[PDB]
């Protein structure tokens, strides 16, 4: 088997599109679903929407632009939903923001999102001659000063460690990614049809195995933006626009016996919370340390 870089991307997107078509071809034929607003602004507000098509974002378009722009994450019953996930049965919806009193749910949803971006930054930035295997997106708590992604690289490429030029280029391509506006999309896949998309990454295939194993229906949660697809835990933030300052700060070589795993550590803030040029240097200092919470 011999594969081109663009071919694999296309194939993944085709698998994903086949998925979508198969999810939509369930023939709901526009069934009426009912949502209620339990939020504190307009209580006793009802929404008659279209089951498994209409979204909690499409529910914000009824209120005002303010909701559309401010709300990162929806709290529907006992679950956070992300804005672009269609809705299943009758629900009750509350909207979450960065300035709310228990933003934590959103915060976890930020790092996850932010981490995923740095995937695109990396895999596509390498020479055709080498090989980049993305491993997992280890979830650190927010008090640790960074977000981290795990990466394995070609064995002959393993001796050199990055230069401030390379780092700055990572940052630059990240911000260039933020520049064009990318929506985030959520799909529910079976382990059988999920294991076919990732393939060549063994760590993806095994992570999928464990993750889908712990939950009885063998369900994998996929997140697609642009040409990139990634499996993660929990919901993501609605648009790429929301991320303002992006930095790829440090990269650290960690070595196990059977694997050489590099951490990519970075820092980012939302356009809502954006911080001053002095503070940014202070936090960009703390993101240089090797930050370990895996378990």
């Amino acid at each position: 088997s011999q594969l081109s870089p663009t071919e694999l991307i296309e194939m993944q997107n085709d698998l994903f599109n086949k998925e979508k078509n198969r999810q939509l071809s369930l023939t709901p034929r526009t069934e009426k679903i009912e949502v209620k607003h339990v939020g504190k602004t307009d209580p006793g507000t009802v929404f008659v929407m279209n089951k498994n098509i209409s979204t909690p974002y499409s529910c914000a378009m009824h209120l005002s632009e303010w909701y559309c722009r401010k709300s990162i994450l929806a709290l529907v019953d006992g679950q956070p939903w992300d804005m672009y996930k269609p809705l299943t049965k009758s629900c009750e919806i509350k909207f979450l923001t960065f300035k709310d009193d228990d933003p934590g749910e959103v915060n976890k949803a930020y790092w996850r999102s932010c981490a995923m971006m740095m995937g695109c930054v990396i895999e596509r930035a390498f020479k055709d001659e080498y090989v980049v295997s993305l491993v997992r997106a280890p979830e650190v708590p927010v008090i640790a000063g960074a977000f981290c992604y795990d990466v394995v690289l070609d064995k002959r490429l393993d001796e050199w460690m990055p230069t401030k030029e390379n780092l700055h280029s990572f940052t630059k391509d990240a911000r260039a990614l933020i520049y064009k506006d990318l929506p985030f999309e959520t799909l529910e896949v079976e382990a059988k049809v999920a294991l076919e998309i990732f393939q060549h990454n063994k760590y993806k295939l095994d992570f999928i195995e464990e993750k889908a194993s712990q939950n009885p229906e063998r369900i994998v949660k996929l997140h697609r933006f642009g040409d990139f697809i990634d499996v993660s835990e929990g919901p993501l933030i609605p648009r790429t626009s929301i991320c303002f300052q992006y930095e790829v700060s440090a990269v650290h070589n960690l070595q196990t016996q059977s694997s050489l795993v590099r951490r990519f550590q970075g820092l980012s803030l939302p356009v809502h919370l954006r911080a001053h040029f002095t503070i940014w240097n202070k936090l960009l200092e703390r993101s240089r340390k090797m930050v370990t919470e895996d378990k």
Binding site: T30, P43, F47, V48, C59, H62
Partner: protein, 242 residues
């Protein structure tokens, strides 16, 4: 809003209008036949449903009495002929809404049938098609109104009809709203037609369209709807029932 400012502007003085108001129609339907609830299933057996219809046609004394008033007042009267012409009135009047021709629409439908159907429909494009009438149209009930003042008698013939129709409503910009035109939807309609007796010119009009309480839910709409809750003024807190 029901309001009269009695303090200032007085009250519109009591006037004797030299023309007593002439009405071709009268809004109310005298008695609504309450249909059997199993008529969705009972219709699967035609010799059961049509048997019950025909039975209650022969058995009713009120219906026979009104039939007698229409038959004495208007000779050459057959009730077996009626559900045919009454079914023709539909294929004509719905085509009238299709083509947005109100002239011919005044001849067919009654004064009360007209305003609703014309009112809410008028700024859009409506296309309607009659494909099959699956169960032969049955006259369910007849009623006679005695107006003591005018000597006026008003006949009202109920027709129940099983029907197959395709409806496409394009909104004023040309984009679809209610339904697809390519689906032969299954529709059951209760209908009431009316007639003026003392009238020399013998008019038979569509009066009203009755829908049973167990009638199947209609097709879901395309666009999403937002129902606002009770509006709160500055000092008024929200209260939520269970």
């Amino acid at each position: 809003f029901v309001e009269h400012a009695r303090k200032a502007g007085l009250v519109i003085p009591h006037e004797r209008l030299e023309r007593p108001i002439h009405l071709a129609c009268t809004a109310g339907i005298f008695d609504a036949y309450v249909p059997p609830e199993g008529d969705a299933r009972i219709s699967s057996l035609s010799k059961e449903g049509l048997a019950q219809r025909a039975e209650r046609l022969k058995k009713n004394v009120a219906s026979q009495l009104s039939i007698r008033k229409i038959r004495e007042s208007d000779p050459n009267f057959k009730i077996k002929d009626f559900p045919e012409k009454a079914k023709d009135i539909f294929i004509e009047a719905h085509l009238c809404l299709n083509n947005s021709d109100h002239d011919r629409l005044h001849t067919l439908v009654t004064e009360n049938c007209f305003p609703d159907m014309v009112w809410d429909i008028r700024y859009k494009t409506v296309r309607w098609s009659f494909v099959e009438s699956l169960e032969p149209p049955q006259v369910v009930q007849v009623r006679c109104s005695s107006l003591m003042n005018q000597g006026n008698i008003y006949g009202q013939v109920t027709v129940r009809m099983h029907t197959r129709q395709t409806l496409a409503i394009y909104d004023r910009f040309g984009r679809l709203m209610y339904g697809q035109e390519d689906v032969p939807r299954d529709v059951l309609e209760y209908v009431v037609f009316e007639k003026h007796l003392v009238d020399p010119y013998g008019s038979w009009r569509m009066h009203g369209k009755i829908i049973p309480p167990w009638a199947p839910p209609k097709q879901p709409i395309l666009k999403t709807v937002m129902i606002p809750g009770p509006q709160l003024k500055p000092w008024e807190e929200f209260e939520e029932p269970q």
